[model samples]
Target: QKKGLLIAVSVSVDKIISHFGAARNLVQKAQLGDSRLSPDVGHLVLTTLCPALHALVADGLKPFRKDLITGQRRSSPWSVVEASVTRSLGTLYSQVSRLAPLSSSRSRFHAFILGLLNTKQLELWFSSLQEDAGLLSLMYMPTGFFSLARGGCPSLSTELLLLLQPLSVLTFHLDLLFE
Candidate 1:
């Protein structure tokens, strides 16, 4: 994988706040009032956000999976995990308080994210993240990475600027500290 083109994000709100801002901004800016993100834009947005989305799945489901077994209905892990995921989603978007109120169209963001994964792929992708420190790479990351690539990730004569997304959270950078 090309490390220079990559960034890692975690499901931990603190860890992922910046990347979330980036993706959200990219969508709004690139779309410029359009509803759907172009494939190139989708690729960038997913790459920026999906690593943590993968982390979210891993962290949300693993608690009752003790003994490496699958009796989780006996455990009801979503009690905490669901709450955390919803609460965090609210932290990201005020509307996503819980699953009860969301119609399929009610949550474009949720639909976009969930549309990217199936149960089996979701499991393997997140389980891979669990083995890491939650800082998974952006290279072909996310469960739908390949599908998104086939449609997007196309050649362009110019490189993307990778500009900032402003609405999620206001952040400051210390360029001097980096180099």
Candidate 2:
């Protein structure tokens, strides 16, 4: 059981690293004006990054699992929780900053990063987890893409949106777009 749990933990960490690496590559390629990336790569970058963000949030909440499983009141591990979330956000910010100059347009990658830093939505989400471990347990609840779409939060702007729009099309009509 211990080995299994360790394996699971390692797998989750690996997924986070893999997703981040893919996002980094997509951002670099996009910045370089690499036509080989196509729009699909852009979409994948956003899709992958969001989930990794969610994973970071989840990891911050993981320490409360015993209380959650036992249906008991739990205490906050505020420092650790905040550190985890902040570290994840920092990684994201660094990646975006590196890509900001590659935007090649008037769109504000830096602005978007700043918006995320200042957003009440993210602040509330992080605070809730830090204050109430029970609320963090609710993270296990099922959520879908439509939920994400409707969730009021900062995201990539119009120019970035246009860059990603081709991903969905490429998935269905790959050959036509590539050749």
Candidate 3:
């Protein structure tokens, strides 16, 4: 009887450990909705979320390197990189605008991008591409190709111009065009 009792206790403990293991796995996979944070959120929110935004923006812009190198001769005369960036930001603008009352979301987001631009985070992103000078040279082109004014859509093009303005290549190209 004593031996049988000992085995029963050992089996019950094993079941308890298995139950906890399953529960922990489930917890990790669980999804929660709406953190409902206030407007006064801290740097933790901006630093954490902004890095993710920067990553997404950089990733979206990267696929157009072939287009850039080939003189974007495939289809549209407009910049593929600019188009993708504009589309990415437009989608975010719509999604964010929906998140808050009135137009504060739009303005706040504009300010956010402006902040990133003024601080040269976007420039750092370009630098971090890890491309050799040969590939880096391909990334530059005349301003006539980008021609943000040709976009026709004032809403996104405005933001897109601001986003693209920090590149020294663009500034140099524009100076030549004006000269």
Task: Please name the candidate that would achieve the greatest TM-score relative to the true structure.
Answer: 1
Model 2 poorest ten-residue lDDT run? 170-179
Runs with alpha carbons beyond 4 Å of true place in candidate 1 = 1-7, 10-37, 56-61, 65-81, 85-179
**Model 3 misplaced stretches (Cα beyond 4 Å):** 1-23, 27-45, 55-93, 98-179
Model 2: pairs clashing at backbone N, Cα or C within 3 Å: 40-167
Q: Distance from true position, residue 60, model 2, in Å?
A: 7.1
lDDT of residue 119 for candidate 1:
16
Give the number of the best model, judged by lDDT.
Answer: 2
> What TM-score does model 1 achieve against the real structure?
0.27
Global lDDT scores for all candidate models: 0.30, 0.34, 0.31
Better of 1 and 3 by lDDT: 3
The positional error of residue 117 in candidate 2, measured at the CA in angstroms, is 10
| Candidate order (lDDT) | 2, 3, 1
Model 1 over residues 23-64: C-alpha lDDT tens digits?
456445434212243233334334444444433333323233
Residue-level error in angstroms, candidate 1, position 156: 36
List the pairs of residues colliding in candidate 1.
none
Q: How would the candidate models be sorted by TM-score, starting from the highest?
A: 1, 2, 3
